[PDB]
Amino acid sequence: VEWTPCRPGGALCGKLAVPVDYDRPDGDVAALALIRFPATGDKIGSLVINPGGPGESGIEAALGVFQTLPKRVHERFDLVGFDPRGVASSRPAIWCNSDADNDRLRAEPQVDYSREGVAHIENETKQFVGRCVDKMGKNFLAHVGTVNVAKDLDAIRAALGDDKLTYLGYSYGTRIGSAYAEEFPQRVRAMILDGAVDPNADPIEAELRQAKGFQDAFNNYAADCAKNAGCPLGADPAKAVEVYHSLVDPLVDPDNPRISRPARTKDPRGLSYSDAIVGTIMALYSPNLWQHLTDGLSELVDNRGDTLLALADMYMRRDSHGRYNNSGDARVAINCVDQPPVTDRDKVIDEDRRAREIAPFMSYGKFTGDAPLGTCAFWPVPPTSQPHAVSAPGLVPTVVVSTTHDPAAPYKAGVDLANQLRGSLLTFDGTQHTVVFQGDSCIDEYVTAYLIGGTTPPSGAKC
């Protein structure tokens, strides 16, 4: 890696060639993008981070993390972020949808699960899968999975000149983590995994646990908002879900589920039902976004949807000029190869029935008896990994940070990951997704002592 100054720090950027196929090590070649924030004091090595997604830029994430990085950490480590294969500035980047493709989907209510509804959705999905293939070719898509990301990470480890890896993983970055840990356990110096993905989980039970997370986060937000003046969801939190549906269901034509009646916005699109739901989910990632959610809901009372639309844009990575990054398309590609998709329709139908019961705030109308299959059931290349209990006997003790009411990565996922890893579980008491290097003194001290000293939190450490 020949470094070079970036395009906001002492930042150096560079690129690193890895092979697309690792069995064809002289075949097609991908170029990963890297950012580097040189340590200020005495350098132990590099702290490599991943934000998750998948499809999220690590370069982008390092620039944020740099802002909230404890002084001692910044002294002891080069902060290093990378864009994984197919993601953001890495070439080739995964691309399936155009900006117009994305907008067209987001305009739909996406709520009709009748036979005709399921056929419509399942048709847009096929068109999507076809767009991925035509633009990427099946070979590249076959090799975008985490198992190969893990191999690139070691190539990264070596190119940065560290003998052993120091790694901070967030959310899906957690799966990159346990993967690298299983393949190169003897190359791991230290590892923090925050907001855990449990690779031994059943995907349907996981998704349902996630539904339950967001409903429970919904409940927490609403209870909190009810203490406040003019709560758009009302002063009785036991009726918040009903009030919420009185605000969002009018965005769907009651005589016809496929017709958007968007709330007015200064943006030309207005606010569809599906955008409304996506904005809500986005806001429930963090209590920091609750104010915005409340604003959006209050706008809905006056038939306006500007804040919810902006929340949905934040989630979908659509900038002010209507442009998308490739996080969405990459997200799908990578998720589809990391595990075998649910292909049994009865399973998908029964999941739907349960989810409406578990997360009503998210569900529109009644169970129909039909449900679409997910994009992955149509993937033209097979998975390159599969659910299993993480096993890395030789691994150094690691830290898993799990938040008690994390909607995206539920607390018990993090416990389970810790156990398979036989590392330390650091608990955060909150309703948010991830927490490391995000302002909390306690968490950050624990993480700093582990990263520098090698010191794990005591059993039962809460924060």
XYZ file of C-alpha atoms in Angstrom:
463
model
C 0.000 0.000 0.000
C 1.471 3.294 -1.173
C -0.316 5.891 0.955
C -1.405 9.395 -0.065
C -3.179 12.373 1.562
C -6.993 12.254 1.386
C -9.304 14.216 -0.959
C -9.840 16.019 7.511
C -7.126 14.860 9.932
C -3.653 13.592 9.181
C -5.498 11.113 6.994
C -3.776 8.864 4.505
C -5.750 6.982 1.870
C -4.692 3.968 -0.125
C -5.815 0.921 -2.027
C -5.077 -2.775 -1.681
C -5.463 -5.448 -4.320
C -6.935 -8.757 -3.258
C -8.083 -11.478 -5.614
C -11.796 -11.838 -6.335
C -11.550 -15.609 -6.176
C -9.013 -16.835 -3.624
C -8.785 -20.164 -5.456
C -8.035 -18.250 -8.626
C -5.359 -16.056 -7.007
C -4.244 -14.810 -10.424
C -7.784 -14.214 -11.657
C -9.816 -11.020 -11.506
C -8.663 -8.569 -8.851
C -10.559 -6.207 -6.522
C -9.116 -3.031 -5.033
C -10.122 -2.192 -1.472
C -10.093 1.426 -0.340
C -8.438 2.383 2.976
C -8.193 5.391 5.268
C -5.559 5.876 7.981
C -5.333 8.214 11.006
C -1.709 7.982 12.284
C -1.311 7.562 16.035
C -0.192 10.617 17.988
C 1.834 8.939 20.740
C 3.562 5.568 20.854
C 2.063 3.218 18.267
C 1.124 -0.294 19.353
C -0.435 -0.960 15.945
C -3.573 -0.291 13.928
C -7.135 -0.185 15.197
C -9.197 -1.511 12.286
C -12.926 -0.811 12.411
C -16.055 -1.947 10.577
C -19.466 -0.245 10.930
C -21.607 -3.062 9.562
C -24.595 -2.973 7.246
C -23.369 -4.792 5.271
C -22.799 -2.171 2.589
C -21.716 0.552 4.987
C -18.436 2.366 4.260
C -15.729 1.824 6.874
C -13.770 4.755 5.510
C -16.845 6.880 6.156
C -17.214 5.329 9.595
C -13.585 5.941 10.606
C -14.053 9.647 9.832
C -16.924 9.725 12.354
C -15.206 7.490 14.913
C -12.151 9.779 14.723
C -14.295 12.505 16.252
C -15.151 10.532 19.415
C -11.984 8.456 19.781
C -10.547 8.525 23.336
C -7.254 10.421 23.508
C -5.320 7.401 24.821
C -6.587 5.238 21.945
C -5.653 7.898 19.383
C -2.177 7.903 20.970
C -1.659 4.146 20.770
C -3.207 3.255 17.392
C -3.470 4.204 13.742
C -7.212 4.396 13.264
C -7.933 2.488 10.077
C -11.157 2.009 8.170
C -11.787 0.118 4.963
C -14.521 -0.281 2.390
C -15.070 -4.073 2.010
C -15.179 -5.797 -1.373
C -18.071 -4.386 -3.396
C -18.722 -1.548 -0.973
C -18.477 2.202 -1.575
C -15.038 3.172 -2.874
C -13.836 -0.405 -3.320
C -13.779 -1.566 -6.936
C -15.802 -3.051 -8.290
C -18.718 -1.636 -6.277
C -21.963 -3.633 -6.215
C -24.673 -1.912 -8.269
C -28.140 -3.231 -9.075
C -30.597 -0.388 -8.810
C -30.540 3.058 -10.319
C -31.683 6.072 -8.334
C -35.028 5.881 -10.164
C -35.453 2.151 -9.405
C -35.091 2.928 -5.719
C -37.536 5.858 -5.705
C -40.132 3.799 -7.548
C -40.077 1.109 -4.900
C -40.192 3.600 -2.046
C -43.282 5.317 -3.577
C -45.316 2.066 -3.170
C -47.213 1.289 0.074
C -45.731 -2.196 -0.094
C -48.501 -3.397 2.073
C -50.741 -5.596 -0.116
C -50.075 -9.264 0.673
C -52.923 -10.668 -1.382
C -51.932 -13.120 -4.122
C -51.760 -10.243 -6.578
C -49.700 -8.207 -4.108
C -47.265 -11.078 -3.499
C -46.897 -11.643 -7.244
C -46.180 -7.935 -7.794
C -43.503 -7.823 -5.073
C -42.016 -11.090 -6.235
C -41.806 -9.659 -9.708
C -39.880 -6.525 -8.679
C -37.518 -8.794 -6.821
C -36.815 -10.934 -9.875
C -36.180 -7.719 -11.852
C -33.772 -6.651 -9.147
C -31.839 -9.915 -9.077
C -31.560 -9.666 -12.864
C -30.189 -6.096 -12.612
C -27.462 -7.274 -10.197
C -26.383 -10.040 -12.561
C -26.320 -7.859 -15.701
C -24.184 -5.203 -14.028
C -21.905 -7.370 -11.841
C -21.702 -10.800 -13.429
C -22.256 -13.880 -11.341
C -18.587 -14.486 -10.503
C -18.112 -11.272 -8.498
C -21.434 -11.710 -6.700
C -20.384 -15.224 -5.780
C -17.424 -13.904 -3.852
C -18.708 -10.862 -1.971
C -19.514 -12.794 1.201
C -18.033 -12.348 4.666
C -15.900 -15.506 4.403
C -13.831 -13.688 1.753
C -14.045 -10.374 3.580
C -12.341 -12.222 6.458
C -9.520 -13.210 4.114
C -9.145 -9.630 2.868
C -8.926 -8.484 6.489
C -5.865 -10.603 6.991
C -4.348 -9.194 3.805
C -5.137 -5.799 5.327
C -3.610 -6.812 8.676
C -0.401 -7.711 6.859
C -0.365 -4.655 4.587
C -0.632 -2.365 7.619
C 2.426 -4.052 9.093
C 0.737 -5.370 12.223
C 1.644 -8.947 13.260
C -1.737 -9.446 14.853
C -5.070 -7.705 14.262
C -6.713 -5.198 16.564
C -10.350 -4.953 15.488
C -13.475 -3.036 16.449
C -16.634 -4.484 14.861
C -20.119 -2.916 14.904
C -23.431 -4.644 14.145
C -22.729 -6.801 11.011
C -19.030 -5.961 11.605
C -19.505 -8.432 14.409
C -19.931 -11.303 11.920
C -16.814 -10.243 10.021
C -15.236 -10.437 13.478
C -16.191 -13.981 14.468
C -15.373 -15.085 10.929
C -11.842 -13.702 11.025
C -11.559 -15.168 14.506
C -12.426 -18.653 13.236
C -10.033 -18.551 10.303
C -7.090 -16.635 11.808
C -7.469 -17.051 15.601
C -3.698 -16.836 16.028
C -3.602 -13.457 14.289
C -6.023 -11.692 16.629
C -4.437 -9.266 19.096
C -7.674 -7.883 20.509
C -11.294 -7.723 19.359
C -14.346 -5.706 20.371
C -17.679 -6.732 18.942
C -20.602 -4.357 19.647
C -24.192 -5.118 18.660
C -23.731 -8.790 18.016
C -24.790 -11.053 15.262
C -25.121 -14.667 16.340
C -24.035 -16.830 13.372
C -25.627 -19.926 14.937
C -29.065 -18.383 14.865
C -32.054 -19.517 12.877
C -32.825 -16.633 10.462
C -36.628 -16.688 10.995
C -36.364 -16.762 14.790
C -33.713 -14.050 14.512
C -35.913 -11.804 12.377
C -38.756 -12.342 14.797
C -36.509 -11.449 17.708
C -35.583 -8.304 15.758
C -39.262 -7.481 15.187
C -39.723 -7.855 18.938
C -36.764 -5.557 19.508
C -38.191 -2.738 17.412
C -41.633 -3.095 18.956
C -40.069 -2.937 22.372
C -38.052 0.106 21.291
C -41.272 1.558 19.956
C -42.851 0.959 23.351
C -39.923 2.704 25.116
C -40.030 5.778 22.775
C -43.767 6.132 23.201
C -43.636 5.795 26.971
C -40.956 8.450 26.961
C -42.862 10.751 24.581
C -45.992 10.413 26.764
C -44.131 12.248 29.592
C -43.722 15.101 27.153
C -45.945 17.978 26.034
C -48.163 17.315 23.044
C -47.078 13.751 22.436
C -48.248 12.988 18.926
C -48.904 9.401 20.066
C -51.019 10.455 23.047
C -50.478 10.523 26.808
C -51.473 6.865 27.257
C -48.650 4.652 25.994
C -50.954 1.595 26.032
C -52.729 3.086 23.007
C -49.657 4.411 21.152
C -49.710 1.671 18.493
C -53.348 2.487 17.642
C -52.641 6.224 17.530
C -49.599 5.521 15.371
C -51.787 3.592 12.852
C -54.326 6.381 12.824
C -51.401 8.547 11.657
C -49.802 6.219 9.080
C -52.640 4.068 7.677
C -54.307 7.081 5.969
C -51.149 7.103 3.786
C -52.705 4.029 2.149
C -55.924 4.067 0.158
C -58.393 2.175 2.372
C -60.322 0.862 -0.599
C -57.151 -0.264 -2.350
C -53.857 -1.344 -0.649
C -51.681 -0.597 -3.661
C -52.463 3.112 -3.834
C -50.233 5.553 -2.016
C -51.900 8.610 -0.536
C -48.657 10.317 0.447
C -48.492 13.076 3.105
C -47.531 16.467 1.673
C -43.842 17.465 1.778
C -41.763 20.225 0.245
C -39.910 17.410 -1.515
C -41.796 16.312 -4.700
C -42.216 12.652 -3.562
C -44.429 13.272 -0.554
C -44.395 10.588 2.191
C -45.502 7.023 1.355
C -46.601 4.546 4.020
C -43.442 2.507 3.462
C -41.219 5.547 3.892
C -43.143 6.377 7.083
C -42.401 2.932 8.529
C -38.754 3.122 7.434
C -38.311 6.531 9.020
C -39.736 5.180 12.283
C -37.410 2.225 12.290
C -34.476 4.490 11.560
C -35.336 6.718 14.542
C -35.533 3.688 16.836
C -31.846 3.018 16.310
C -31.084 5.681 18.896
C -32.816 7.908 21.518
C -30.892 10.703 19.767
C -33.433 10.343 16.942
C -36.553 10.308 19.125
C -36.969 14.107 18.849
C -37.021 13.747 15.068
C -39.528 10.877 15.193
C -41.803 12.995 17.386
C -41.433 15.862 14.925
C -42.309 13.580 12.011
C -45.362 12.195 13.792
C -46.535 15.695 14.684
C -46.168 16.652 11.029
C -48.397 13.693 10.173
C -51.131 15.157 12.374
C -51.237 18.092 9.920
C -50.865 15.737 6.934
C -47.189 16.551 6.413
C -44.361 14.043 6.107
C -41.105 16.002 5.738
C -39.215 14.741 8.772
C -40.245 11.096 8.319
C -39.172 11.314 4.646
C -35.803 12.700 5.708
C -35.516 9.886 8.278
C -36.276 7.389 5.504
C -33.607 9.055 3.317
C -31.033 8.764 6.129
C -31.829 5.075 6.359
C -31.707 4.559 2.558
C -28.659 6.804 1.971
C -30.298 9.117 -0.527
C -28.546 12.475 -0.573
C -30.053 15.941 -1.110
C -29.740 15.644 -4.888
C -31.603 12.341 -5.050
C -28.471 10.181 -5.359
C -28.045 6.858 -3.558
C -24.815 5.272 -2.458
C -24.513 1.551 -3.056
C -25.116 0.480 0.564
C -28.555 -1.014 -0.238
C -27.505 -3.103 -3.235
C -24.311 -4.275 -1.504
C -26.302 -4.975 1.680
C -28.476 -7.460 -0.249
C -25.697 -9.125 -2.268
C -23.603 -9.769 0.842
C -26.484 -10.895 3.019
C -27.612 -13.319 0.307
C -24.276 -15.163 0.135
C -23.643 -15.269 3.920
C -26.335 -17.903 4.600
C -28.889 -20.141 2.807
C -32.156 -18.252 2.189
C -35.545 -19.378 3.415
C -37.149 -20.863 0.342
C -40.141 -22.562 1.970
C -43.247 -20.405 1.395
C -45.134 -21.814 4.415
C -42.244 -20.703 6.639
C -42.364 -17.169 5.189
C -46.154 -17.107 5.540
C -45.992 -18.284 9.155
C -43.277 -15.782 9.972
C -45.510 -13.026 8.682
C -48.416 -14.176 10.864
C -46.217 -14.125 13.942
C -44.530 -10.810 13.153
C -47.910 -9.025 12.898
C -48.542 -10.227 16.430
C -45.049 -9.417 17.688
C -44.585 -6.012 16.015
C -48.039 -4.545 15.274
C -46.625 -0.983 14.913
C -44.976 -2.376 11.759
C -47.931 -4.256 10.376
C -50.741 -3.036 8.207
C -54.212 -4.547 8.280
C -54.720 -8.263 8.839
C -52.892 -11.458 8.084
C -53.824 -12.464 4.543
C -52.451 -15.988 4.452
C -49.861 -15.058 1.862
C -46.478 -13.321 2.082
C -43.658 -12.581 -0.310
C -40.393 -14.467 -0.414
C -37.296 -12.417 0.336
C -34.900 -11.242 -2.337
C -32.450 -13.945 -1.291
C -34.700 -16.877 -2.164
C -34.020 -15.789 -5.789
C -30.251 -15.349 -5.596
C -28.415 -16.842 -8.611
C -25.237 -17.692 -6.666
C -25.163 -20.017 -3.582
C -24.199 -19.133 -0.002
C -20.518 -19.204 0.995
C -21.233 -19.688 4.732
C -23.967 -21.187 6.882
C -25.325 -20.957 10.432
C -23.087 -22.630 12.988
C -21.791 -22.215 16.525
C -18.689 -20.033 16.486
C -15.695 -22.153 17.336
C -12.268 -20.612 17.757
C -10.710 -22.493 20.680
C -7.341 -20.725 20.610
C -8.767 -17.184 20.489
C -7.581 -14.436 22.877
C -10.287 -13.237 25.297
C -12.526 -10.758 23.424
C -15.124 -8.193 24.415
C -18.723 -8.327 23.343
C -20.781 -5.257 24.079
C -24.503 -5.903 24.166
C -27.239 -3.329 24.893
C -30.223 -4.462 26.991
C -32.857 -3.089 24.579
C -31.042 -3.027 21.266
C -33.809 -3.417 18.611
C -31.421 -4.421 15.774
C -29.108 -6.713 17.719
C -31.059 -7.910 20.766
C -29.239 -8.311 24.088
C -29.422 -12.142 24.144
C -27.719 -12.353 20.738
C -24.702 -10.719 22.358
C -24.740 -13.057 25.307
C -24.820 -16.054 22.967
C -21.936 -14.713 20.884
C -19.899 -14.145 24.024
C -20.463 -17.710 25.138
C -19.417 -19.305 21.829
C -16.417 -16.993 21.885
C -15.863 -17.598 25.626
C -15.038 -13.900 25.988
C -16.342 -11.071 28.181
C -19.864 -9.674 27.990
C -20.023 -5.928 28.754
C -23.666 -4.841 29.233
C -25.032 -1.393 28.300
C -28.390 -0.430 29.740
C -30.245 1.354 26.964
C -32.578 1.371 23.979
C -30.206 1.780 21.081
C -28.075 -0.077 18.586
C -24.372 -0.132 19.490
C -22.675 2.301 21.866
C -18.885 1.958 21.744
C -17.102 5.303 21.095
C -20.428 7.117 21.140
C -20.101 9.329 24.204
C -20.476 6.927 27.159
C -17.558 7.343 29.588
C -17.932 3.923 31.218
C -18.082 1.835 27.997
C -15.176 3.797 26.520
C -12.907 3.312 29.544
C -13.512 -0.451 29.530
C -12.832 -0.541 25.836
C -9.688 1.590 26.207
C -8.218 -0.570 28.969
C -8.871 -3.730 26.963
C -7.418 -2.275 23.773
C -4.210 -1.030 25.408
C -3.792 -3.131 28.561
C -5.515 -6.339 27.457
C -7.818 -6.058 30.446
C -11.302 -7.567 30.161
C -14.316 -6.283 32.067
C -15.201 -8.268 35.191
C -17.987 -10.815 34.929
C -21.305 -8.958 35.169
C -19.849 -5.569 34.159
C -22.811 -3.213 33.520
C -22.563 0.328 32.188
